[PDB]
Amino acid sequence: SCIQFTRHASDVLLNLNRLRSRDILTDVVIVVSREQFRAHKTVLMACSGLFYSIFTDQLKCNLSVINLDPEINPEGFCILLDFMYTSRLNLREGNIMAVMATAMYLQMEHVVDTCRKFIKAS
Amino acid sequence: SCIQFTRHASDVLLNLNRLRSRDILTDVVIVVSREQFRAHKTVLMACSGLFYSIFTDQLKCNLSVINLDPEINPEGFCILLDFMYTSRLNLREGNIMAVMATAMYLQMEHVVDTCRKFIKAS
């Protein structure tokens, strides 16, 4: 018999993104080639099958630095990290291939699905 | 020119609640009288003006245990912690006064607003 506040989840995500922009309580650095991205492990786990696997591992859960596969494009990662914290995906003709490949590696099934649909249309 | 995934914020919150139920990456214990509640500092900050103030404080940001004011009812806190992680508020005739008082202390303005509306109706 609960009541529900419709905007609550969106408002929580907006505040987590504000914490990220101000580098508050970030507990991991994701290294993609020369580029570094600060984030919250819990947000990464909630969005990605790959980060979920990494941070539930008894040894990796304690690492402050995670290095991604050298094939991963920093721009594709940046677009996906922004999507994790906002629900908004900056999908463009010039980045769609790098975004789909990064989403497949990160195991973000809904992003992979929209990339496959957008590629099929063109 | 971004696209948006409607269910993303709700799905993120659902996964953060799953991490909470399994005690994964919880980094703080909230003590309310004899009762203890494990949570994620970032989720508490995103939902509460009080926890936002506590965990942005250069000294308190590093505490693993936070003791609430002895006037705070553990049941009222539990209902509010569940709301933070689910958007669902278990508001009942028998708990509304304890929920409103706890939401005022935690600075959760939308919960305070619905409690005032529900009390006014009765």
Binding site: C2, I3, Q4, T6 | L89, T114
Partner: peptide, 4 residues
């Protein structure tokens, strides 16, 4: 607020 809604009835979910």
């Amino acid at each position: 607020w809604v009835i979910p």
